[PDB]
UniProtKB/Swiss-Prot annotation:
The modification Phosphotyrosine is found at residue 44. This is Beta-arrestin-1. It comes from Rattus norvegicus. Residues 42-83 are annotated as: Interaction with CHRM2. PANTHER family: ARRESTIN, BETA-ARRESTIN-1. GO terms for cellular component: basolateral plasma membrane; chromatin; clathrin-coated pit; cytoplasm; cytoplasmic vesicle; cytosol; dendritic spine; endosome. Predominantly localized in neuronal tissues and in the spleen.
């Protein structure tokens, strides 16, 4: 049915890995499996073992993996699997993709499968402090196929193939509408408050999905609201290797909409957080490299009560701010409204097999 397979080969061209996808969705209860095949040249059946490794790491540094001073690494999950010879099989519930690719590719195709446990951090990367784009903090998911004899041998880079895959976070919606945030404020000389109320149409938004902010002002003061700023801010808390908090606006609408003294005002504003308009910003959490076009704003960190926060590396969350600019001569009244930002739902309601390079995007 038009099956695209992504593939990459070792530098020495003797090992090749096939995947059906780059992005593996996390569904809260399960992460859909990394189901792949490794083709091998029998030319190397002398060295005689083909291992595949999934590594999940928090790193500080470059994606070239140079360790050119001031580098950090901490593994968060590791899964090794001996793909040749076919070991005590565990479970090889060969996916239709796997059975297809094995029988098309031939005798020396051997499957590999990784089950990613839930509650791992999704792919995320962030450039800290000054803009030099030198080194980045992040979590990535590396798939590594190599021919060796054991898992202690130093492996020559000509024999390895490395693919950086993405774990992306989905969550479904089932609401009864989101609660309002609200603030009462008195303005010398008030004696009666300006009351600010705002709410959001959904708890859960997806990349590219517009956000609608319902804004309701009851001004029992003599002051005049002159301007209304509506904002989406990302919050990014580094919790491994170097504790730090960043906050970056990612959408903004100023309306010269006024609220008259002793009047009530109501209006729905609509706003979409877009990475394209933050391509320049640093301290901004993304789900992948700025280079690649499949990169978006980082998804929200799904936190379950009493979960180890530290090993998530980067806690990402999002808020809508509604700010009333009040003429004194100016003052600010505001609320902030939490929401969850998720990866959009994957559209999946002779031989159709077109190989594509995995290499980047």
């Amino acid at each position: 049915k038009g099956t695209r397979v992504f593939k990459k080969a070792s530098p020495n061209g003797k090992l090749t890995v096939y995947l059906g996808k780059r992005d593996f969705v996390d569904h809260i209860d399960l992460v859909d499996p990394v189901d792949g095949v490794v083709l091998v040249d029998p030319e190397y059946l002398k060295e005689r073992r083909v291992y595949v490794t999934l590594t999940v790491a928090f790193r500080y540094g470059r994606e070239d993996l140079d360790v050119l001073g001031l580098t950090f690494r901490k593994d968060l999950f590791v899964a090794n699997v001996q793909s040749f010879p076919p070991a005590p099989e565990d479970k090889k519930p060969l996916t239709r993709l796997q059975e297809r690719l094995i029988k098309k590719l031939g005798e020396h195709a051997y499957p590999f499968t990784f089950e990613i446990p839930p509650n791992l951090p999704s792919s995320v990367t962030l450039q800290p402090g000054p803009e030099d784009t030198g080194k980045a903090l992040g979590v990535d998911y590396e798939v590594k196929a190599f021919v060796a004899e054991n898992l202690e041998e130093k492996i020559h880079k000509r024999n390895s193939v490395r693919l950086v895959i993405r774990k992306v976070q989905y969550a479904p919606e089932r609401p009864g509408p989101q609660p309002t945030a609200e603030t009462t404020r008195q303005f010398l000389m008030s004696d009666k408050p300006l009351h600010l109320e705002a709410s959001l149409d959904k708890e859960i938004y997806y990349h590219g999905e517009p956000i609608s902010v319902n804004v309701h002002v009851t001004n029992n003061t003599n002051k005049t609201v002159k301007k209304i700023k509506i904002s989406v801010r990302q919050y990014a808390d580094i919790v491994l290797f170097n504790t730090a908090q960043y906050k970056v606006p990612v959408a903004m609408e100023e309306a010269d909409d006024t609220v008259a003294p002793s009047s009530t005002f109501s209006k729905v504003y609509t706003l979409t957080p877009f990475l394209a308009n933050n391509r320049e910003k640093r301290g901004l959490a993304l789900d992948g490299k700025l280079k690649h076009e499949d990169t978006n704003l980082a998804s929200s960190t799904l936190l379950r009560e009493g979960a180890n926060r530290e090993i998530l590396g980067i806690i990402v969350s999002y808020k809508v701010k509604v700010k009333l600019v009040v003429s004194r001569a100016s003052s600010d009244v505001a609320v902030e409204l939490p929401f969850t930002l998720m990866h959009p739902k994957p559209k999946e309601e002779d031989d159709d097999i077109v190989f594509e390079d995995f290499a980047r995007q």
